[PDB]
CSV table of C-alpha atoms and ligand atoms in Angstrom, one decimal:
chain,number,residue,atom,x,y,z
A,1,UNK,CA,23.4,4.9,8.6
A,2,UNK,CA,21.7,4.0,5.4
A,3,UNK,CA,17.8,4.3,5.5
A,4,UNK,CA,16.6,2.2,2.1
A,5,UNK,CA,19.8,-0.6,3.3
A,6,UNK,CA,18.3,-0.5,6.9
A,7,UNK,CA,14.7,-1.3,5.4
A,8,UNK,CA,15.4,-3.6,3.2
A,9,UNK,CA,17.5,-5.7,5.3
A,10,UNK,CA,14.7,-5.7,8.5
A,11,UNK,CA,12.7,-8.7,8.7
A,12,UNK,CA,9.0,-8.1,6.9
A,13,UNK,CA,6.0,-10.0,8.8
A,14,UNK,CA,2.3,-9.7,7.9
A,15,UNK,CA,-0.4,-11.3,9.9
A,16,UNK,CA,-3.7,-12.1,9.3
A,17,UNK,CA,-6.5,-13.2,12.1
A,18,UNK,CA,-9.6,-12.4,14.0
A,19,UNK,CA,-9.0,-8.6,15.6
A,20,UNK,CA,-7.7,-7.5,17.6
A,21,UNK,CA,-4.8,-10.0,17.4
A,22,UNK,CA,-1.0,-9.3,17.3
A,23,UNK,CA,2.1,-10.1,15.3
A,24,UNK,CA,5.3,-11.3,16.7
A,25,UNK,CA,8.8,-10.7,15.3
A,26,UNK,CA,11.1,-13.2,14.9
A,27,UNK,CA,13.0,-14.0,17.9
A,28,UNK,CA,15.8,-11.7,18.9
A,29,UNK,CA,14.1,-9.2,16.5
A,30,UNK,CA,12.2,-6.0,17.9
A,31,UNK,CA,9.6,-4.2,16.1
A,32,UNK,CA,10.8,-0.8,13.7
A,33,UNK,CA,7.7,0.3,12.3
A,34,UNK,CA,4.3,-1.5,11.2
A,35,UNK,CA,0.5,-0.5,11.0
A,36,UNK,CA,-2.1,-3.0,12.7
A,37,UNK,CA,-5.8,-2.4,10.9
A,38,UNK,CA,-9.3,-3.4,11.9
A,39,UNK,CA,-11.5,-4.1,9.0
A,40,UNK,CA,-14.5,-5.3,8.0
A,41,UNK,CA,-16.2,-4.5,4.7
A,42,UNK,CA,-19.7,-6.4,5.4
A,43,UNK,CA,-21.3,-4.8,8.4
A,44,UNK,CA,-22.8,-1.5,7.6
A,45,UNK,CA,-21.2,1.6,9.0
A,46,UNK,CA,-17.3,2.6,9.1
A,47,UNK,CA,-16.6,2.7,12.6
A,48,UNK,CA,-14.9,-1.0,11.8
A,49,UNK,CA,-12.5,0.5,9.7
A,50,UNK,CA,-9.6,1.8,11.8
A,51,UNK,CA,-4.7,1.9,11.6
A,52,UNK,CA,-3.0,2.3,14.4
A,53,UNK,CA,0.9,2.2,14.3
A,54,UNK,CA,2.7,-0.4,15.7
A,55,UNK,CA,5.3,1.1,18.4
A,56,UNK,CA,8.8,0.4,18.2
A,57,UNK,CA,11.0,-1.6,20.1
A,58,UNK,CA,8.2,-4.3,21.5
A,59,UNK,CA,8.9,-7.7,20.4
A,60,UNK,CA,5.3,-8.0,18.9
A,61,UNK,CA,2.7,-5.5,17.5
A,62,UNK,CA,-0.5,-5.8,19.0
A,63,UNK,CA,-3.7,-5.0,17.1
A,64,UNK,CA,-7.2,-3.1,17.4
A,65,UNK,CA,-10.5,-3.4,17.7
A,66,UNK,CA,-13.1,-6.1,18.7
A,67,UNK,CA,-13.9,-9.6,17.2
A,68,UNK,CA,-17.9,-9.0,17.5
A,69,UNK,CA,-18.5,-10.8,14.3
A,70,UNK,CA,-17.0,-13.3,11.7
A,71,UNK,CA,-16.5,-10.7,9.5
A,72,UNK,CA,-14.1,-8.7,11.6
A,73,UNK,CA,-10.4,-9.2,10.4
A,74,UNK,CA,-7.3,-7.7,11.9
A,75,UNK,CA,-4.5,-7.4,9.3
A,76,UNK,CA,-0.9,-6.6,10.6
A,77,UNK,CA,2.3,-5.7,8.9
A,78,UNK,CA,5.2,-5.0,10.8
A,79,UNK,CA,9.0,-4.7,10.1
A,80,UNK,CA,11.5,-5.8,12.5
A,81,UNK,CA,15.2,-5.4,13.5
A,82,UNK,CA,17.6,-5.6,15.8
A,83,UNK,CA,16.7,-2.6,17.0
A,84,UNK,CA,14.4,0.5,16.3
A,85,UNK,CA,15.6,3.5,14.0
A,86,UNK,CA,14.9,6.5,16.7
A,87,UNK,CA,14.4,8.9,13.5
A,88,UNK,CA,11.7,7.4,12.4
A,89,UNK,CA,8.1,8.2,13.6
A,90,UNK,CA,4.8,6.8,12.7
A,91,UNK,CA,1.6,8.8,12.3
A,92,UNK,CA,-1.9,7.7,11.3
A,93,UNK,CA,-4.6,9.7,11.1
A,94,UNK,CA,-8.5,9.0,10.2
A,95,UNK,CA,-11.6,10.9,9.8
A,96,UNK,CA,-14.8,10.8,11.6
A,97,UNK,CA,-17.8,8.9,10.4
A,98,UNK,CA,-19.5,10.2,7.6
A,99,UNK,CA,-16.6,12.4,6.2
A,100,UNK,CA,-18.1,13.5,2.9
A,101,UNK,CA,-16.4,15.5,0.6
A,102,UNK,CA,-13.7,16.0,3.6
A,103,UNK,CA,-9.9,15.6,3.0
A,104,UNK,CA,-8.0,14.0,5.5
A,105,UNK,CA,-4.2,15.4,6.5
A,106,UNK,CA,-1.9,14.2,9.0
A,107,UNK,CA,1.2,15.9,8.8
A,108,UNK,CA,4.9,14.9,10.2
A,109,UNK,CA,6.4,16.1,13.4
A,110,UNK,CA,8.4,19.3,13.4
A,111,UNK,CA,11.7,18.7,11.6
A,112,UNK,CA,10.9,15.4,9.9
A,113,UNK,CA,9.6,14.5,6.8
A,114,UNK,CA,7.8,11.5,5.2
A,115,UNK,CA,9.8,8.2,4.4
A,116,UNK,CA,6.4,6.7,3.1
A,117,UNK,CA,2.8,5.7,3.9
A,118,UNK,CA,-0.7,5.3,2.4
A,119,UNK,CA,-4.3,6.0,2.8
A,120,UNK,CA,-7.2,4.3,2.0
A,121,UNK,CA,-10.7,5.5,1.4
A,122,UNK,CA,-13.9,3.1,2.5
A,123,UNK,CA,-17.3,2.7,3.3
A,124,UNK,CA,-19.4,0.1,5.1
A,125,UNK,CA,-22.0,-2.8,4.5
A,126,UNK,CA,-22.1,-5.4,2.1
A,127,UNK,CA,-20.8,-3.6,-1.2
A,128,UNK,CA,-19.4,-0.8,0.4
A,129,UNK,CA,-16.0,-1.9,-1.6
A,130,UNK,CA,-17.7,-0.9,-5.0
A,131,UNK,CA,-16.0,2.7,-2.8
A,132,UNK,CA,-12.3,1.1,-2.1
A,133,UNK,CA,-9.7,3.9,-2.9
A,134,UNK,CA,-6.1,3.4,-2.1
A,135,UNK,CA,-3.1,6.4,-2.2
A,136,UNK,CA,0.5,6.3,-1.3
A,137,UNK,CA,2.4,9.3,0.7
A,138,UNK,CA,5.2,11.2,-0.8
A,139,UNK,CA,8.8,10.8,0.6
A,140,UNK,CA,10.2,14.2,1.1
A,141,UNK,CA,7.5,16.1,2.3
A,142,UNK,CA,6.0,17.2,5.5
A,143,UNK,CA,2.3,15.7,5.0
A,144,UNK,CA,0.2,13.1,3.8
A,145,UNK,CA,-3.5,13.8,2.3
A,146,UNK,CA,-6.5,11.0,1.4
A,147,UNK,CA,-9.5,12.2,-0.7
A,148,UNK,CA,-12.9,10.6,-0.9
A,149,UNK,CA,-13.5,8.8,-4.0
A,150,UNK,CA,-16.4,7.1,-5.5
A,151,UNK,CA,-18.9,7.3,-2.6
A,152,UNK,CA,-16.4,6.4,0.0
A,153,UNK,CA,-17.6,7.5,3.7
A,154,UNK,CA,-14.2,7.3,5.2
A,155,UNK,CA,-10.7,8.0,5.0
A,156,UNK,CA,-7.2,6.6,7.4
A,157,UNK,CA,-3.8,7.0,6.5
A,158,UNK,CA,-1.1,5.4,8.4
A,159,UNK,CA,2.8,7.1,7.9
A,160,UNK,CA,6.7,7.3,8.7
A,161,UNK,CA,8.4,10.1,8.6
A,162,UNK,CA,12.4,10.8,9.6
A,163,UNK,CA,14.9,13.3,10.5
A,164,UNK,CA,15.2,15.1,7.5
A,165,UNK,CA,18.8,14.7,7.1
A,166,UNK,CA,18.8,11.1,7.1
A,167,UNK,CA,20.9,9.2,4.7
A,168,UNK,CA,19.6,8.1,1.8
A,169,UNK,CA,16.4,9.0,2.2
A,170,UNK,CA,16.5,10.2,-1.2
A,171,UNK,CA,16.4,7.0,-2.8
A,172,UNK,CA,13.3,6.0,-1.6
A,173,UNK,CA,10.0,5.9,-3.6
A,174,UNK,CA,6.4,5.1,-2.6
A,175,UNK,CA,3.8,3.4,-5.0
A,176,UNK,CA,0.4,2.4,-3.5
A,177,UNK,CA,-1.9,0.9,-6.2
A,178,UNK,CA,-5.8,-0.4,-6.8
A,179,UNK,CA,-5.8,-3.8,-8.8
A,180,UNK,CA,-8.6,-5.6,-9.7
A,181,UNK,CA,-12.1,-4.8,-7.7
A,182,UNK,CA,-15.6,-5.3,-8.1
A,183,UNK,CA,-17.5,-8.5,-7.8
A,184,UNK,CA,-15.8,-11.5,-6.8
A,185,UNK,CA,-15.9,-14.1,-9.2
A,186,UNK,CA,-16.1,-18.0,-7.8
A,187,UNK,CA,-15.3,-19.3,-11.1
A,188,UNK,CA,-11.7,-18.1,-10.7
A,189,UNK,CA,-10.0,-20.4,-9.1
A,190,UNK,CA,-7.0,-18.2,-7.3
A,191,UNK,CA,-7.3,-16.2,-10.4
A,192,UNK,CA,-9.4,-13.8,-9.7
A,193,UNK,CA,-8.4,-10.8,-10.3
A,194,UNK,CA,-4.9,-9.3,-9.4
A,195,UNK,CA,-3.0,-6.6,-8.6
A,196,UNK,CA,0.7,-5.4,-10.0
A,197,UNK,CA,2.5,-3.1,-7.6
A,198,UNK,CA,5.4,-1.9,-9.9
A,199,UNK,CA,8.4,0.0,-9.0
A,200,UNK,CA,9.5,2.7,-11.3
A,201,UNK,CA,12.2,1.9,-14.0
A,202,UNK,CA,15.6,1.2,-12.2
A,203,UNK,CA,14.6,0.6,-8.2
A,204,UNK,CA,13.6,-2.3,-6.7
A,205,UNK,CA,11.6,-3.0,-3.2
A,206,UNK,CA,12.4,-2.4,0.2
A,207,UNK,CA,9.2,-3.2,1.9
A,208,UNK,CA,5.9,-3.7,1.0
A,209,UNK,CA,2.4,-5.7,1.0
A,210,UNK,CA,-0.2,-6.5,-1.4
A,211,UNK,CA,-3.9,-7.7,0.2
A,212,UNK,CA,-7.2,-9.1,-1.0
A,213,UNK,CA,-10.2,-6.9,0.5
A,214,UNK,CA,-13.2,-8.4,0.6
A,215,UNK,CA,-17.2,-8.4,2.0
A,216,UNK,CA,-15.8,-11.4,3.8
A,217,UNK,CA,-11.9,-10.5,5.1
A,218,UNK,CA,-12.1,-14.2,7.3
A,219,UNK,CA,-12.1,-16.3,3.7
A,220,UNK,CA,-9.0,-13.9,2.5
A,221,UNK,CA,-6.6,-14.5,5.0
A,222,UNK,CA,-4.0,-15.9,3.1
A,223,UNK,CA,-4.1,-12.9,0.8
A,224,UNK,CA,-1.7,-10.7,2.4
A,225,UNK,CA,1.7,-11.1,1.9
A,226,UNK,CA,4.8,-9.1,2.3
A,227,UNK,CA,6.5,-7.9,-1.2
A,228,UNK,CA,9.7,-9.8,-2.2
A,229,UNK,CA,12.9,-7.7,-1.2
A,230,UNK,CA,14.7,-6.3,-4.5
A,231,UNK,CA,12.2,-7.4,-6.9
A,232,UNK,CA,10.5,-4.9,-9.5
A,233,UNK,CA,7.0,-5.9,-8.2
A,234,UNK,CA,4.7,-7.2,-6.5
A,235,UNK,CA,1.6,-9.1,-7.6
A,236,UNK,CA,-1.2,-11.2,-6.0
A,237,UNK,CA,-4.4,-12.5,-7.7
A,238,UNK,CA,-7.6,-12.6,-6.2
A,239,UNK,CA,-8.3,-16.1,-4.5
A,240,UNK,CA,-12.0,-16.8,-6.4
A,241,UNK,CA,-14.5,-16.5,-3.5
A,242,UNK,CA,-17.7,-15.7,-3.0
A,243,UNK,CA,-20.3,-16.4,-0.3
A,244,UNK,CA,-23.0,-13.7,-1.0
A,245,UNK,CA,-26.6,-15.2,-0.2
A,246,UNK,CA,-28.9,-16.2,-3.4
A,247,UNK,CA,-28.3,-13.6,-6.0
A,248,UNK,CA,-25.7,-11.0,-4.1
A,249,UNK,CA,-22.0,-11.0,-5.1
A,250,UNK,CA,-19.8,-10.4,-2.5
A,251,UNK,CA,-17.1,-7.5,-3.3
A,252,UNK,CA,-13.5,-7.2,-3.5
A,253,UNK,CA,-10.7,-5.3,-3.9
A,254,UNK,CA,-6.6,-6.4,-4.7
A,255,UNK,CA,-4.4,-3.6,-3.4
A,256,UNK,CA,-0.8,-2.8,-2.5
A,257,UNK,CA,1.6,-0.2,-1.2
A,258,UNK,CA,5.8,-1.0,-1.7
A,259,UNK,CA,8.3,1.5,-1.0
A,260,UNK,CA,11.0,1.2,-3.8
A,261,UNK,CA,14.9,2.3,-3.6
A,262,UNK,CA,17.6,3.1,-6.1
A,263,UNK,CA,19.6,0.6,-7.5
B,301,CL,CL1,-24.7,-7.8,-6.0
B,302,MG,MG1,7.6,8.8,-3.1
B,303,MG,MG1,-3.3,2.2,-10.8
């Protein structure tokens, strides 16, 4: 029909909550694409850090992973219609542990290509967000890569891709960006920080999210939101907390992805 029309119109929902957790569409509504994440950026290791897709057609999108402490969040976005877009297929990839200087590809499925995506770089314990790294995928072509950056230890990319042909696929634009990270800052009271996703000159959004990381994802929760369709941006500022013991600063990290169309 009209890809960036279809996306736009489908209902947004992103879901926050201990893991693995799920997301429901609204009623009547079935589920058209959407990544469910496990994260945790306080215990030390990356094994916490995983995407799955969230398969199409179900009425909800169920997550991954275990709630073994407090500091295990799930984190859900899913977009849902009336009913699935068969051309689309998801794809997430992730390295193993300890990835060094290792670029991780996933690639689309013979005769598709990407609609949009993003990967993020991470590593584990308490300030492993001082190594936060966020890229988007490309619309138009037939792979998605995610390179280590600043000390990061691990990478995962979640993607859609579609029949190449499909109608205005052309239109659509991806922009992934890294706001504000570092320290968080107490004495910012929902100020702390932000981040700006902006859409190139003359498109607006289809889809997106913008999300607070932090050393303690349970006291975040409310920072992840969908992005507001047809607007130039998206923006969320960091929510001013910090509950690292005596003299240690919990980390954080504002980030977004939105796909942009044409106007
Ligand atoms: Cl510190
Ligand atoms: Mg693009
Ligand atoms: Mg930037």
């Amino acid at each position: 029909r009209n890809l960036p029309k279809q996306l736009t119109q489908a209902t947004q929902v992103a879901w926050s909550g201990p893991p693995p957790g799920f997301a429901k569409c609204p009623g009547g509504q079935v589920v058209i694409l959407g990544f469910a994440m496990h994260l945790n950026f306080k215990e030390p290791g990356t094994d916490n850090f995983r995407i799955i897709s969230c398969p199409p057609g179900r009425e909800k999108c169920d997550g991954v992973g275990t709630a073994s402490s407090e500091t295990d969040e799930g984190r859900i976005y899913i977009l849902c219609g009336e009913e699935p877009i068969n051309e689309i297929q998801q794809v997430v990839a992730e390295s193993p542990a300890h990835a060094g200087a290792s670029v991780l590809e996933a690639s689309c499925p013979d005769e598709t290509v990407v609609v949009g995506g993003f990967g993020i770089s991470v590593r584990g314990g308490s300030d492993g967000l001082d190594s936060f790294s966020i890229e988007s995928c490309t619309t138009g072509q037939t792979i998605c890569t995610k390179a280590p950056t600043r000390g990061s230890e691990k990478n995962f990319l979640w993607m859609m891709c579609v029949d190449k042909q499909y109608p205005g696929l052309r239109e659509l634009v991806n922009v992934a960006e890294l706001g504000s990270h570092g320290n968080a800052n107490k004495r910012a009271v929902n100020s702390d920080g932000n981040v700006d996703v902006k859409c190139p000159a003359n498109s607006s959004i289809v889809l997106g999210y913008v999300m607070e990381a932090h050393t303690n994802m349970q006291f975040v929760r409310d920072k992840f939101l969908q992005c507001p369709e047809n607007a130039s941006e998206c923006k969320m500022t960091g929510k001013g907390v910090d509950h690292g013991m005596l003299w240690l600063f919990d980390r954080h990290a504002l980030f977004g992805w939105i796909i942009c169309k044409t106007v």
